[PDB]
Design a protein around this ligand. Structure first.
Ligand code: ZN
Lengths: 98, 188
């Protein structure tokens, strides 16, 4: 019987991983706590105040890709997964149920 | 009993490799102290989790790709950069011992041996010291099967109050005459 023959394993960002606790639930837990926007600061600083959280979260979730590439993959997988669509509409369904 | 015996350098035949032996000679030259690596430490830029390389050899190859699972499980080909602060260095010093004039047979050249001394034992040896040094006699590959060989030092045995004790001679007296006669006392 067959003694082993090799193959190359691979990993990428995926909707299940993006739906794990360290994915979007981490955002719902931490984003409103960590981002703060104020009229007391210029636009560049406020934009950075948004971006710093999402960049650190994106790295800690999936350290392979650059932040811009991460955003592109997030947009495309968001465009093309039913589970992620269900979760996303479920957030606003919950807000509608408030 | 072999670690007790004070061999001359030419009596250190190849049969003694790996053994703890004691060698009697004069230190003919000594290197300045240099840092040898024991464990190299690498920071990883793209995950922060450091990694380490223990070095057992005269030479080593530096790591590049982050082997830590914090990178590798994410298949993230992050970059390793060496850091001196987090690396364990050890004090290293190379010395050369040479067999004494009484040990040389008739008509032979005085043979000599490299001593490698590490750690706290460093700079226990000075040139011109006549000394017994215990160490592990070991090979090093460079020739082909001929070996470089050295002694990993382990122990050193050297062969070689006043402001009131001076009052002994002051009270003993006739100091100029006696101290003058004491220069080369056997010389008439
Ligand atoms: Zn890493």
């Amino acid at each position: 019987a067959i003694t082993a023959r090799k193959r190359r394993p691979q990993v990428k960002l995926t909707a299940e991983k993006l739906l794990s606790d360290k994915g979007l639930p981490y955002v719902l837990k931490n984003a409103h706590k960590r981002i703060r926007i104020s009229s007391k600061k210029n636009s560049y600083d406020n934009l950075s105040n948004i971006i710093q959280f999402y960049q650190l979260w994106a790295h800690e979730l999936f350290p392979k890709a650059k932040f811009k590439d991460f955003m592109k993959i997030c947009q495309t997988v968001g465009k093309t997964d039913p589970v992620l669509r269900e979760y996303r509409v479920s957030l606003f369904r919950d807000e509608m149920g408030m | 009993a072999i670690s007790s015996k004070p061999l001359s350098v030419r009596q250190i035949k190849g049969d003694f490799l790996g053994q703890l032996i004691t060698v009697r000679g004069i230190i003919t030259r000594v290197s300045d102290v240099k840092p040898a690596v024991e464990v190299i430490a690498y920071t990883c830029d793209q995950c922060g989790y450091e990694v380490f390389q223990e070095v057992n050899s005269r030479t080593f190859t530096p790591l590049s790709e982050c082997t830590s699972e914090e990178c590798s499980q994410n298949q993230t080909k992050g970059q390793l950069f060496m850091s001196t602060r987090a690396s364990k260095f050890s004090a290293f010093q190379e010395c050369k011992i040479q067999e004494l004039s009484q040990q040389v047979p008739v008509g032979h050249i005085p043979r000599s041996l490299n001593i490698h001394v590490n750690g706290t034992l460093v700079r226990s040896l000075s040139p011109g010291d006549i000394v017994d040094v215990t160490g592990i006699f070991l090979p090093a590959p460079y020739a082909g099967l001929l070996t470089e060989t050295y002694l990993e030092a382990q122990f050193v045995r050297q062969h070689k109050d006043v402001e009131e004790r001076v009052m002994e001679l002051i009270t003993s007296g006739d100091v100029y005459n006696r101290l003058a006669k004491s220069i080369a006392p056997e010389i008439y």
